[PDB]
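Quick bug: Cysteine protease falcipain-3 output formatted oddly.
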Amino acid sequence: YEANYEDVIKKYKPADAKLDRIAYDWRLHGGVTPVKDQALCGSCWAFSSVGSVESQYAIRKKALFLFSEQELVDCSVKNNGCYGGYITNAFDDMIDLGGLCSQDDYPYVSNLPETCNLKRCNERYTIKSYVSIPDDKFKEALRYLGPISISIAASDDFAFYRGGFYDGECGAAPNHAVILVGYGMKDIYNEDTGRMEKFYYYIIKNSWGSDWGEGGYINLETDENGYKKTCSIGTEAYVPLLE
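Here's what came back:
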């Protein structure tokens, strides 16, 4: 089920397009659905992977789709519900189960035990495959393929984050799943040097509610190429594909 990047990008990047590497934010280009809260349940793997698919649908169909994390939590036997999971395992089960359900059909129930039961899903919403995004292609993947389901090494400093550019510590190891939604640059004046300088960053949609971070999102430093990986973001990096 996993497609190969070099095959997938030749299909979706217009031939010889030049990538604008300074700024591109899916929230200003119709690729991001509202922020969710996983509450008291270790289901980031679902939110990340499912939000990914919400984002592909939005981009490819110019229509708002809200899908059900709880379905994956209840049904994805390759993951551990509220005790963690894996991005690829999440994509595999979306496919082997015959698709996502709408959030309406199958609402979030956090850590309440719930039987897996697809008969409560009327319409089903499929993906065809998913693709791993190489470490040196995140900006290219973002612009042309869409938001990326990614791992991140979170630390207890994330608790305090409520906007700006994060300068807390990182986790020892990758331990949380988020969605990469864009990148930006701010020209910051430097009082010492008396020169303007450029500050690049990646933009990430978290699943801890809109009261965490910047309306739900976190800004992390990177460089012009987008090779710098603050908090080990994207060690696992996947985009779902609708065809």
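Actually, after a second look the formatting is fine. The beta strands are 2-3, 24-25, 100-101, 124-125, 129-132, 148-152, 176-189, 196-205, 217-222, 237-241. Closing.
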